Amino acid sequence: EDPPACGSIVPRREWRALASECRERLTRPVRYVVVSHTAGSHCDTPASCAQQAQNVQSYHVRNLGWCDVGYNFLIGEDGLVYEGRGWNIKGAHAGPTWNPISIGISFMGNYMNRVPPPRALRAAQNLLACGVALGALRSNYEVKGHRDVQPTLSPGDRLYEIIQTWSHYRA
Amino acid sequence: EDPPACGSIVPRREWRALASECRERLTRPVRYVVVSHTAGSHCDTPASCAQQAQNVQSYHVRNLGWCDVGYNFLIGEDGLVYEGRGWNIKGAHAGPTWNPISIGISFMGNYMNRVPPPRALRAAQNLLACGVALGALRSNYEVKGHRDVQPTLSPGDRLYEIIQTWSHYRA
Amino acid sequence: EDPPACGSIVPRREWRALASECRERLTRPVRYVVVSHTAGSHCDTPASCAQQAQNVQSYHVRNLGWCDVGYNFLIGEDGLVYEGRGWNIKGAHAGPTWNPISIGISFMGNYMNRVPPPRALRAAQNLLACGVALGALRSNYEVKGHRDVQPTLSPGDRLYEIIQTWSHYRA
Amino acid sequence: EDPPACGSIVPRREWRALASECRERLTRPVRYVVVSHTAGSHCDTPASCAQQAQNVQSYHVRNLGWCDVGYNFLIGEDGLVYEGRGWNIKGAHAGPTWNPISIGISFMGNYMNRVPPPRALRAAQNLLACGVALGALRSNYEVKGHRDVQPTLSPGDRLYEIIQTWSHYRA
Ligand SMILES: CC(=O)N[C@@H]1[C@@H](O)[C@H](O)[C@@H](CO)O[C@H]1O
């Protein structure tokens, strides 16, 4: 019953998220984390980043007919984590084989030629450790890059470069 | 005026494709066509494009553990079409919703800031007219840009701009 | 919204349904469809089935005190669809979580050790396509078994196996 | 192999139809629709109507020596449409002048003194809509009564006075 406050996550409520229609649950503890980037434009302020989390959701919900933004979490260059489908709802970010067994976090921006600032990277790792402390992720979870499970440039070369060094990454 | 009347396709063996291990079939006539790009590099000769079709397949078969290259057909800038999974086999290029009901054709290259050459676009429209002539594609099939059904930049800003002018493009 | 008033539905007055007292509405377009069975007596003729539809409403209204037959539509082995609360009104067939966001259709009979006849499955499917055309359902709607969203045997072992092969089925 | 047909048509084989041998094709989109009655017995259940469709085809095949049942589609009082020669084959229901430019639908029964139940009327109109839906009929298609293109009592007094009230009816 150990209680920690590892969630310095901006709530859907707070980034003006449209309401989710998703009902399918992940079974904890989740063993995989798949890292992607939106490939889109980036933000570096709480205000713009909240606004960007919105556009990403608008795209998935309005243009694509999805029950909610596809990621469980989004990482801003502002150093904040934006709540997506969360720890308990199966996301739609890495395909039918990986979605039901993973948490998909995506960095807001295109990282083919830039690396996300340290605070975005710090936000991501602290987010994952958080998950472990909650029991949402296996203490020994594995990190995959989006391009490792689906044909895509995601999460971007430079950021892909970075996640390959991470302690929990696995081929 | 009689039977086998359509398009020139570089066959699997001619580009050295690894044997296909896929078996799930499409239901002809197919109604949808999803246009993508590889997002990687391009080619402009029988030899380089036949080399590239191989890589793309390699990526999808080794690195992604798939039964065959994800696309039904790949388009080269050498103005030729490369047999992928073909007309009758369910591909893996657009998600579990569109894959079973569409034919995915991928242009080899990256077209965000670059358009395919005239002959690659002819090769592609010619392939479709061929799909119709054979009863593999509905007479009134619909063309979709990858970004219209999956979150991605595919098939690149420029190509995306082009397929939307197409007779069979339905938003 | 659109001109294709669709398919054939036996209207309320024809199967002689007591007037409905329901008022809550579903929001168009609806994302989910929950298939169930009545676990009651089966019928195979326009006359026998109308009677059966009447019995189900009767049980729901008179004994369970609902504002109307719980299902949005009922499906007879006579191969005809029967109107229930319709496409616009919130039904009562899958609990508090699902009734507000779904369309519940029910095959009239006990499909534990029987399958409904081909025509019944055809009417059921036609109804859904019709729903899409009308805009009552999402083009990318989802079909769920009653047992997937509630603790029940419904819609029967046989029919459950059958709805799993529907292109819109998502577990 | 995908969801069944609009109009919930009973397929040739489901009513144990003898294989067709007709080859002349209709040039859909077709302009006219001719409504006739079989002047045979009527039926009001799928079982009795499957047998009636069998009987009508057998009289056309065994006795008149035709390539198949004359009507493109048959309608039962059970409220189902039965597949005849379908949307693509020239019929043999209205004469050398009409069969080449029409779709012939026939109500199973004698409607001189009787009327067909609403469900039979509904299947018919829906079948017609399902026609254009598929693109087998022209948008502004015209409905003619059998006795409007040939000297005959078909489709009977009662049914004839009804189809006059239909919206797409003519002279
Ligand atoms: C809305 C609708 O019914 N559309 C029809 C459908 O019945 C059929 O399954 C499909 C494939 O042939 O052709 C469409 O025209």
XYZ file of C-alpha atoms and ligand atoms in Angstrom:
699
model
C 0.000 0.000 0.000
C 3.118 2.157 -0.437
C 1.974 5.580 -1.679
C 4.079 7.817 -3.947
C 3.035 10.899 -5.965
C 4.940 10.076 -9.113
C 2.264 11.628 -11.330
C 3.399 15.057 -12.469
C 1.132 14.430 -15.444
C -1.111 17.055 -17.032
C -4.674 15.604 -16.897
C -6.820 15.266 -20.006
C -9.129 17.744 -18.279
C -6.277 20.260 -18.140
C -5.232 20.118 -21.791
C -8.837 20.464 -22.860
C -9.014 16.897 -24.184
C -12.178 15.762 -25.941
C -13.820 12.860 -24.094
C -12.534 9.345 -24.792
C -14.809 6.640 -26.166
C -12.229 3.894 -25.618
C -13.214 1.009 -23.318
C -10.585 -1.717 -23.862
C -8.228 -2.273 -20.938
C -4.598 -3.178 -20.625
C -3.875 -5.872 -18.060
C -1.252 -4.776 -15.546
C 1.606 -5.120 -15.083
C 2.433 -4.215 -18.707
C 5.735 -5.600 -19.994
C 6.453 -3.284 -22.937
C 6.843 0.404 -23.664
C 6.912 1.555 -27.307
C 8.452 4.958 -28.009
C 7.220 7.098 -30.900
C 7.143 10.679 -31.986
C 4.186 12.454 -33.493
C 6.441 13.376 -36.427
C 4.527 16.652 -36.343
C 5.199 20.203 -35.180
C 6.542 20.726 -31.661
C 5.798 22.898 -28.598
C 7.892 24.122 -25.653
C 5.431 25.809 -23.275
C 2.654 24.442 -21.141
C 0.183 26.528 -23.163
C 1.404 25.573 -26.624
C 2.040 22.001 -25.582
C -1.489 21.665 -24.186
C -2.614 23.085 -27.515
C -0.497 20.564 -29.388
C -1.780 17.580 -27.399
C -5.157 18.825 -28.623
C -4.287 18.845 -32.300
C -2.748 15.411 -32.051
C -6.040 14.224 -30.518
C -8.171 16.115 -33.024
C -6.296 14.316 -35.789
C -6.799 10.828 -34.323
C -10.420 11.464 -33.299
C -11.801 13.761 -36.017
C -9.836 12.851 -39.150
C -9.300 9.169 -38.287
C -12.486 8.294 -36.391
C -10.612 6.988 -33.339
C -12.013 6.638 -29.800
C -9.175 8.823 -28.517
C -5.647 10.033 -29.144
C -3.649 6.861 -29.842
C -0.969 7.169 -27.182
C -1.189 6.311 -23.516
C 0.994 9.360 -22.856
C 2.570 12.296 -24.713
C 5.840 14.011 -23.925
C 6.151 17.772 -24.330
C 9.315 19.730 -24.949
C 8.033 21.770 -22.032
C 9.082 18.894 -19.762
C 5.533 17.818 -18.939
C 3.716 14.551 -19.547
C 0.284 14.751 -21.089
C -2.222 12.110 -20.180
C -3.472 10.085 -23.122
C -5.425 6.900 -22.770
C -3.492 6.472 -19.547
C -2.088 3.433 -17.748
C -5.210 1.289 -18.094
C -6.635 1.729 -21.604
C -5.143 -0.149 -24.562
C -3.675 2.482 -26.873
C -3.603 2.489 -30.700
C -0.016 3.344 -31.524
C 1.927 0.221 -32.465
C -0.239 -2.365 -34.220
C -2.605 -5.201 -33.088
C 0.239 -7.373 -31.818
C 1.883 -4.770 -29.562
C -1.026 -2.522 -28.514
C -2.567 -5.018 -26.024
C 0.785 -5.689 -24.280
C 2.345 -2.219 -24.221
C 2.171 1.412 -23.178
C 2.854 3.803 -25.994
C 4.389 7.160 -25.147
C 5.084 9.624 -27.946
C 7.304 12.730 -27.957
C 5.553 15.762 -29.413
C 7.625 16.747 -32.435
C 9.691 15.407 -35.318
C 12.978 14.013 -34.112
C 14.615 12.962 -37.358
C 17.009 15.861 -37.044
C 16.681 17.333 -33.524
C 16.854 15.567 -30.178
C 14.188 16.443 -27.650
C 15.555 18.701 -24.882
C 16.828 17.010 -21.676
C 13.651 17.915 -19.817
C 11.556 15.920 -22.311
C 13.882 12.978 -21.869
C 13.783 13.409 -18.060
C 9.989 13.621 -18.209
C 9.848 10.316 -20.111
C 12.110 8.280 -17.771
C 10.443 9.672 -14.634
C 7.128 8.722 -16.250
C 8.273 5.156 -16.702
C 9.761 4.791 -13.201
C 6.381 6.143 -11.998
C 4.617 3.320 -13.790
C 6.826 0.765 -12.119
C 6.115 2.191 -8.668
C 2.364 1.977 -9.337
C 2.514 -1.604 -10.492
C 1.400 -0.583 -13.972
C 4.642 -1.794 -15.596
C 6.817 -4.805 -14.808
C 9.886 -3.644 -12.895
C 11.819 -5.281 -15.727
C 9.890 -3.719 -18.630
C 11.314 -3.534 -22.140
C 11.502 -0.403 -24.287
C 10.977 -0.679 -28.058
C 11.307 2.067 -30.646
C 8.292 2.471 -32.965
C 10.389 1.477 -35.984
C 11.254 -1.793 -34.209
C 7.686 -3.087 -34.406
C 6.095 -1.200 -37.324
C 7.590 0.138 -40.540
C 8.073 3.825 -39.765
C 10.758 6.452 -39.310
C 9.255 7.005 -35.866
C 10.531 7.782 -33.297
C 13.054 9.693 -35.407
C 16.736 8.904 -35.931
C 18.290 11.056 -33.275
C 15.761 10.098 -30.613
C 15.930 6.488 -31.783
C 19.686 6.837 -31.316
C 18.947 7.875 -27.727
C 16.430 5.232 -26.707
C 18.804 2.509 -27.973
C 21.159 3.431 -25.106
C 18.467 3.299 -22.431
C 18.865 0.691 -19.714
C 15.534 -1.015 -20.396
C 15.786 -1.026 -24.171
C 15.860 -4.424 -25.799
C 16.783 -5.238 -29.448
C -10.822 -7.294 -77.082
C -9.620 -10.396 -75.113
C -8.216 -11.714 -71.686
C -4.657 -10.855 -70.250
C -4.594 -7.127 -71.158
C -2.772 -5.072 -68.495
C 0.439 -3.650 -66.959
C 4.063 -4.748 -66.668
C 5.065 -5.964 -63.220
C 8.498 -6.946 -61.966
C 7.683 -10.363 -60.440
C 8.856 -11.517 -56.985
C 11.536 -13.837 -58.363
C 12.887 -11.134 -60.637
C 13.693 -8.918 -57.638
C 14.779 -11.932 -55.525
C 11.996 -11.633 -52.932
C 12.153 -14.110 -50.073
C 9.373 -16.669 -50.354
C 6.074 -15.345 -49.030
C 4.752 -17.049 -45.930
C 1.485 -15.138 -45.892
C -1.776 -16.955 -46.718
C -4.735 -14.771 -45.700
C -6.543 -13.536 -48.830
C -8.386 -10.406 -49.907
C -11.895 -10.645 -51.246
C -12.090 -9.533 -54.849
C -13.225 -7.167 -55.963
C -11.343 -4.913 -53.544
C -12.909 -1.479 -52.988
C -10.051 0.419 -51.404
C -6.518 1.396 -52.358
C -4.209 2.950 -49.766
C -1.239 4.931 -51.116
C 1.964 5.150 -49.128
C 5.632 5.836 -49.370
C 8.496 3.838 -47.891
C 9.801 6.999 -46.362
C 13.268 5.701 -46.900
C 15.442 6.375 -49.950
C 14.471 5.963 -53.616
C 15.938 4.403 -56.767
C 15.762 5.050 -60.481
C 17.047 1.939 -62.277
C 15.856 -1.631 -62.593
C 18.886 -2.694 -60.534
C 18.617 -0.177 -57.688
C 14.842 -0.442 -57.400
C 15.109 -4.226 -57.435
C 17.752 -3.876 -54.744
C 15.498 -1.607 -52.719
C 12.382 -3.764 -52.982
C 14.584 -6.395 -51.368
C 15.635 -4.129 -48.471
C 12.088 -3.036 -47.767
C 11.151 -6.700 -47.721
C 14.147 -7.500 -45.532
C 13.083 -4.859 -43.004
C 9.518 -6.201 -42.822
C 10.521 -9.864 -42.704
C 13.610 -9.880 -40.496
C 13.350 -6.749 -38.311
C 9.539 -6.849 -38.041
C 9.061 -10.598 -38.096
C 6.395 -10.423 -40.822
C 5.371 -13.142 -43.317
C 6.100 -10.998 -46.380
C 6.805 -7.397 -47.390
C 3.823 -5.421 -46.085
C 2.769 -3.949 -49.446
C 0.746 -5.548 -52.243
C 2.789 -3.559 -54.756
C 5.779 -1.210 -54.649
C 6.318 1.545 -57.272
C 9.829 2.450 -58.407
C 11.076 5.712 -59.821
C 12.519 3.554 -62.586
C 8.895 3.605 -63.741
C 8.300 -0.025 -62.848
C 5.971 -1.859 -60.460
C 7.308 -4.462 -58.060
C 5.087 -7.374 -57.099
C 4.570 -7.360 -53.353
C 1.853 -9.497 -51.793
C -0.137 -8.817 -54.949
C -3.859 -8.672 -55.722
C -5.111 -11.594 -53.597
C -3.164 -11.473 -50.320
C -4.065 -9.306 -47.299
C -1.154 -6.913 -46.822
C 0.127 -5.080 -43.747
C 0.372 -1.401 -44.620
C -2.666 0.309 -43.112
C -3.821 -1.138 -39.783
C -6.185 -4.056 -38.961
C -9.182 -2.137 -40.265
C -8.078 -1.260 -43.809
C -5.638 -4.102 -44.475
C -8.389 -6.743 -45.001
C -10.282 -4.544 -47.416
C -7.698 -2.660 -49.436
C -4.654 -3.026 -51.687
C -1.687 -1.037 -50.458
C 0.717 0.399 -52.985
C 3.956 1.963 -51.793
C 6.160 4.390 -53.749
C 9.792 3.687 -52.924
C 11.257 6.886 -51.535
C 10.297 9.911 -49.454
C 7.911 12.440 -50.939
C 7.476 15.046 -48.188
C 9.432 17.601 -50.144
C 9.798 15.674 -53.412
C 7.390 14.347 -56.060
C 7.683 10.990 -57.817
C 8.710 11.245 -61.477
C 6.028 11.113 -64.243
C 6.667 7.427 -65.027
C 6.231 6.317 -61.418
C 2.814 7.980 -61.397
C 1.952 6.374 -64.735
C 3.172 3.003 -63.497
C 0.833 3.439 -60.530
C -2.289 4.621 -62.302
C -1.695 1.969 -64.952
C -1.469 -0.705 -62.209
C -4.848 0.325 -60.879
C -6.572 0.364 -64.259
C -5.130 -3.171 -64.451
C -6.643 -4.032 -61.108
C -10.019 -2.982 -62.388
C -9.630 -4.787 -65.716
C -8.890 -8.003 -63.785
C -11.685 -7.801 -61.238
C -9.240 -7.418 -58.374
C -10.401 -3.850 -57.772
C -13.982 -2.532 -57.971
C -14.757 -0.364 -60.964
C -15.523 2.383 -58.462
C -12.693 1.655 -56.011
C -11.483 4.479 -53.785
C -7.958 5.869 -53.343
C -6.900 6.864 -49.854
C -3.688 8.465 -48.735
C -2.058 6.540 -45.893
C -2.286 9.611 -43.606
C -6.073 9.416 -44.121
C -6.332 6.068 -42.312
C -3.263 5.787 -40.072
C -1.399 8.442 -38.130
C 1.618 9.088 -40.357
C 3.029 11.626 -42.810
C 3.022 8.843 -45.401
C 2.876 9.226 -48.391
C 4.639 12.584 -47.971
C 3.219 16.074 -48.398
C 3.901 16.262 -52.110
C 2.686 12.819 -53.273
C -0.313 13.169 -50.920
C -1.085 16.401 -52.800
C -1.046 14.475 -56.079
C -3.239 11.456 -55.319
C -5.966 13.844 -54.148
C -6.337 15.058 -57.716
C -7.036 11.477 -58.786
C -10.325 10.353 -60.251
C -10.691 7.734 -57.538
C -9.616 9.763 -54.524
C -12.320 9.887 -51.900
C -11.365 11.947 -48.810
C -28.944 13.137 -42.664
C -28.696 11.168 -45.967
C -31.429 10.017 -48.503
C -31.021 6.205 -48.435
C -33.831 5.331 -45.988
C -32.426 1.830 -45.635
C -33.394 -1.839 -45.720
C -36.632 -3.338 -44.511
C -37.615 -3.127 -40.861
C -40.880 -4.409 -39.440
C -42.335 -1.280 -37.705
C -43.582 -1.095 -34.093
C -47.301 -1.048 -34.952
C -46.944 -4.105 -37.196
C -45.591 -6.382 -34.513
C -48.134 -4.581 -32.322
C -45.821 -3.065 -29.734
C -47.140 -1.166 -26.751
C -46.207 2.482 -27.064
C -42.734 3.255 -25.779
C -42.173 5.539 -22.784
C -38.450 5.989 -23.480
C -36.850 9.443 -23.863
C -33.084 9.364 -23.408
C -31.127 9.571 -26.662
C -27.871 8.179 -28.014
C -25.469 10.569 -29.677
C -25.063 9.970 -33.414
C -22.910 8.502 -34.643
C -22.720 5.431 -32.358
C -19.438 3.520 -32.156
C -20.573 0.195 -30.705
C -23.001 -2.604 -31.496
C -23.698 -5.287 -28.893
C -25.114 -8.574 -30.193
C -27.168 -10.786 -27.864
C -29.857 -13.448 -27.919
C -33.178 -13.529 -26.095
C -32.553 -16.973 -24.691
C -36.274 -17.311 -25.311
C -38.382 -19.282 -27.804
C -37.420 -19.116 -31.463
C -39.783 -18.474 -34.417
C -39.434 -18.883 -38.177
C -42.392 -17.082 -39.773
C -43.456 -13.379 -39.971
C -46.455 -14.230 -37.820
C -44.718 -16.334 -35.205
C -41.902 -13.845 -34.827
C -44.119 -10.771 -34.487
C -45.748 -12.608 -31.623
C -42.342 -13.367 -30.149
C -41.180 -9.774 -30.404
C -44.374 -8.801 -28.588
C -43.633 -11.299 -25.799
C -40.139 -9.901 -25.254
C -41.398 -6.299 -25.001
C -44.151 -7.512 -22.697
C -41.654 -9.195 -20.374
C -39.430 -6.087 -20.354
C -42.178 -3.543 -19.809
C -44.627 -5.452 -17.602
C -42.155 -7.423 -15.416
C -38.819 -5.594 -15.502
C -40.525 -2.203 -15.707
C -38.459 -0.801 -18.572
C -39.819 2.052 -20.750
C -39.893 -0.290 -23.706
C -38.401 -3.455 -25.123
C -34.728 -3.233 -24.075
C -33.168 -3.969 -27.471
C -32.693 -1.410 -30.240
C -33.644 -4.101 -32.804
C -34.574 -7.777 -32.683
C -33.734 -10.338 -35.379
C -36.013 -13.231 -36.227
C -35.207 -16.546 -37.835
C -37.959 -15.564 -40.260
C -35.201 -13.431 -41.721
C -36.769 -10.093 -40.851
C -35.562 -7.350 -38.515
C -37.961 -5.993 -35.900
C -37.893 -2.437 -34.676
C -37.275 -1.837 -31.015
C -36.093 1.454 -29.581
C -34.605 2.157 -33.038
C -31.353 3.989 -33.881
C -31.959 7.082 -31.748
C -33.041 5.890 -28.270
C -30.847 4.486 -25.459
C -31.656 0.802 -25.037
C -31.290 -1.472 -22.001
C -29.429 -4.639 -23.002
C -25.872 -4.320 -21.707
C -25.665 -2.577 -18.337
C -24.975 1.116 -17.373
C -21.549 1.338 -18.952
C -22.589 0.179 -22.415
C -26.276 1.144 -22.903
C -25.428 4.848 -23.313
C -22.835 4.299 -26.080
C -24.132 1.348 -28.122
C -26.760 -0.168 -30.409
C -28.042 -3.461 -29.070
C -29.502 -5.974 -31.515
C -30.808 -9.311 -30.331
C -31.427 -12.547 -32.224
C -34.678 -14.045 -30.949
C -33.953 -17.548 -29.642
C -31.446 -19.609 -27.659
C -28.241 -19.952 -29.629
C -26.255 -22.106 -27.188
C -26.797 -25.268 -29.215
C -28.100 -23.802 -32.523
C -27.079 -21.156 -35.027
C -29.495 -18.715 -36.461
C -30.337 -19.422 -40.135
C -28.437 -17.645 -42.926
C -31.252 -15.142 -43.589
C -31.192 -14.015 -39.938
C -27.456 -13.305 -40.086
C -28.096 -11.485 -43.367
C -30.792 -9.244 -41.911
C -28.565 -8.489 -38.923
C -25.665 -7.441 -41.131
C -27.848 -5.476 -43.531
C -29.294 -3.556 -40.611
C -25.818 -2.467 -39.557
C -24.726 -1.375 -43.028
C -28.009 0.466 -43.145
C -27.077 2.062 -39.848
C -23.838 3.288 -41.315
C -25.554 4.698 -44.400
C -28.002 6.550 -42.108
C -25.178 7.831 -39.943
C -26.603 6.179 -36.826
C -23.462 4.067 -36.642
C -19.830 5.013 -37.303
C -18.386 3.763 -40.555
C -15.708 2.267 -38.312
C -18.216 0.954 -35.773
C -17.388 -2.117 -33.663
C -19.301 -5.312 -32.953
C -19.156 -6.762 -29.458
C -20.700 -9.915 -28.100
C -22.926 -9.463 -25.056
C -20.490 -11.610 -23.052
C -17.555 -9.331 -23.988
C -19.145 -6.424 -22.185
C -21.171 -8.169 -19.474
C -21.108 -11.432 -17.505
C -23.402 -13.608 -19.583
C -23.722 -16.645 -21.806
C -25.466 -14.389 -24.343
C -25.510 -14.430 -27.337
C -25.031 -18.196 -27.135
C -21.966 -20.322 -27.900
C -22.826 -20.906 -31.550
C -23.807 -17.380 -32.573
C -20.895 -15.979 -30.572
C -18.496 -18.076 -32.640
C -20.228 -16.709 -35.726
C -20.038 -13.017 -34.890
C -16.294 -13.385 -34.299
C -15.779 -13.718 -38.062
C -17.520 -10.411 -38.794
C -15.144 -7.834 -40.316
C -16.298 -5.334 -37.695
C -15.830 -7.623 -34.703
C -13.343 -6.400 -32.096
C -13.098 -8.432 -28.856
C -16.810 -13.321 -48.638
C -17.565 -9.898 -47.135
C -20.865 -8.874 -45.510
C -23.925 -10.089 -47.445
C -25.969 -8.121 -49.977
C -28.195 -5.157 -49.470
C -31.838 -6.113 -49.871
C -31.230 -9.275 -47.822
C -31.731 -11.390 -50.914
C -32.210 -15.154 -50.541
C -29.424 -16.564 -52.768
C -30.283 -18.857 -55.715
C -28.846 -21.895 -53.938
C -30.666 -21.277 -50.636
C -33.961 -21.906 -52.376
C -32.538 -24.942 -54.137
C -32.622 -23.321 -57.558
C -31.531 -25.325 -60.600
C -28.341 -23.841 -62.053
C -28.817 -21.053 -64.581
C -27.775 -21.304 -68.218
C -28.583 -17.775 -69.352
C -25.788 -15.785 -70.964
C -27.238 -12.519 -72.300
C -26.209 -9.664 -69.989
C -28.152 -6.580 -68.903
C -26.463 -3.220 -69.398
C -26.703 -1.824 -65.834
C -27.389 0.954 -64.894
C -30.798 -0.082 -66.264
C -33.685 2.313 -66.781
C -36.942 0.415 -66.267
C -38.360 -1.938 -63.622
C -41.388 -4.082 -64.423
C -43.637 -5.362 -61.639
C -45.640 -8.507 -62.360
C -47.213 -11.255 -60.310
C -46.619 -14.974 -60.773
C -50.334 -15.680 -60.894
C -49.273 -18.763 -58.996
C -49.999 -19.777 -55.419
C -48.807 -17.369 -52.768
C -46.735 -18.332 -49.731
C -46.068 -16.551 -46.453
C -43.100 -18.275 -44.772
C -39.522 -18.785 -45.968
C -40.155 -22.506 -46.209
C -43.304 -22.153 -48.312
C -41.783 -19.414 -50.449
C -38.526 -21.209 -51.158
C -40.674 -24.056 -52.467
C -42.752 -21.621 -54.528
C -39.655 -20.092 -56.135
C -38.507 -23.635 -56.916
C -41.865 -24.320 -58.508
C -41.902 -21.206 -60.662
C -38.359 -21.803 -61.951
C -39.162 -25.449 -62.721
C -42.155 -24.478 -64.817
C -39.917 -22.068 -66.728
C -37.060 -24.542 -67.110
C -38.725 -27.946 -67.478
C -41.815 -26.819 -69.388
C -41.144 -23.578 -71.250
C -37.568 -24.686 -71.719
C -35.999 -21.374 -70.632
C -32.384 -20.939 -69.487
C -33.581 -19.963 -66.014
C -36.542 -18.558 -64.071
C -37.788 -15.615 -66.099
C -37.769 -12.877 -63.441
C -34.662 -11.054 -62.276
C -36.101 -11.191 -58.746
C -39.019 -12.802 -56.954
C -40.817 -11.451 -53.848
C -42.566 -13.524 -51.190
C -45.354 -12.563 -48.825
C -42.919 -13.703 -46.135
C -41.314 -10.363 -46.865
C -38.148 -11.688 -48.515
C -36.664 -11.123 -51.955
C -35.620 -14.233 -53.866
C -32.802 -14.149 -56.359
C -33.814 -14.909 -59.905
C -31.526 -13.987 -62.754
C -30.284 -11.075 -60.638
C -29.031 -7.611 -61.608
C -26.891 -8.656 -64.560
C -28.804 -11.097 -66.774
C -31.463 -10.276 -69.392
C -34.799 -11.378 -68.039
C -37.755 -13.026 -69.742
C -40.762 -11.553 -68.003
C -41.876 -8.647 -70.147
C -41.308 -9.352 -73.832
C -38.701 -8.691 -76.557
C -39.306 -4.961 -76.221
C -38.858 -4.828 -72.445
C -36.626 -7.646 -71.135
C -33.482 -6.043 -72.626
C -34.104 -2.684 -70.963
C -35.638 -3.684 -67.617
C -35.307 -5.479 -64.309
C -38.266 -7.741 -63.742
C -39.553 -8.292 -60.248
C -42.469 -10.628 -59.598
C -44.709 -10.892 -56.554
C -45.470 -14.541 -55.839
C -49.218 -14.904 -55.923
C -52.343 -13.680 -57.669
C -53.132 -10.144 -56.631
C -56.360 -9.613 -58.544
C -58.503 -9.755 -55.422
C -55.735 -9.868 -52.771
C -52.988 -7.452 -51.727
C -49.459 -8.310 -50.767
C -48.608 -7.627 -47.085
C -46.619 -4.465 -46.212
C -43.431 -6.478 -45.672
C -43.615 -7.704 -49.261
C -44.065 -4.153 -50.429
C -41.097 -3.107 -48.228
C -38.731 -5.807 -49.528
C -39.497 -4.715 -53.092
C -38.859 -0.999 -52.634
C -35.758 -1.708 -50.570
C -34.561 -4.165 -53.223
C -34.890 -1.408 -55.774
C -32.919 1.083 -53.694
C -30.284 -1.590 -53.078
C -30.107 -1.728 -56.837
C -28.889 1.796 -57.414
C -26.834 1.428 -54.259
C -24.973 -1.301 -56.125
C -25.338 0.703 -59.309
C -27.471 -1.812 -61.170
C -30.329 0.643 -61.626
C -30.312 4.244 -62.801
C -31.022 6.936 -60.200
C -34.172 8.124 -61.980
C -35.392 4.610 -62.750
C -39.037 4.198 -63.800
C -41.499 1.587 -62.572
C -43.933 0.081 -65.079
C -46.654 -2.438 -64.347
C -46.662 -5.689 -66.336
C -49.998 -4.654 -67.882
C -48.421 -1.348 -68.943
C -46.060 -2.938 -71.451
C -48.036 -6.075 -72.299
C -51.603 -7.277 -72.603
C -52.036 -9.118 -69.293
C -53.870 -8.886 -65.965
C -50.539 -9.151 -64.114
C -49.717 -7.876 -61.478
C -53.420 -7.973 -60.596
C -55.893 -5.184 -59.872
C -55.031 -4.614 -56.192
C -51.244 -4.621 -56.552
C -51.446 -2.543 -59.698
C -53.412 0.212 -57.989
C -50.727 0.260 -55.273
C -47.574 0.577 -57.395
C -49.272 3.500 -59.073
C -49.008 5.323 -55.800
C -45.254 4.567 -55.628
C -43.034 7.649 -56.222
C -40.986 6.399 -59.198
C -44.072 5.075 -61.011
C -44.906 5.948 -64.610
C -47.924 5.820 -66.957
C -24.852 0.347 -48.601
C -24.790 -0.933 -49.410
O -25.612 -1.825 -49.223
N -23.814 -1.011 -50.304
C -23.692 -2.149 -51.193
C -23.550 -3.440 -50.347
O -24.836 -4.020 -50.166
C -22.619 -4.501 -50.950
O -22.163 -5.397 -49.939
C -21.428 -3.834 -51.609
C -20.487 -4.824 -52.233
O -21.101 -5.428 -53.356
O -21.906 -2.994 -52.659
C -22.533 -1.825 -52.148
O -23.015 -1.091 -53.224
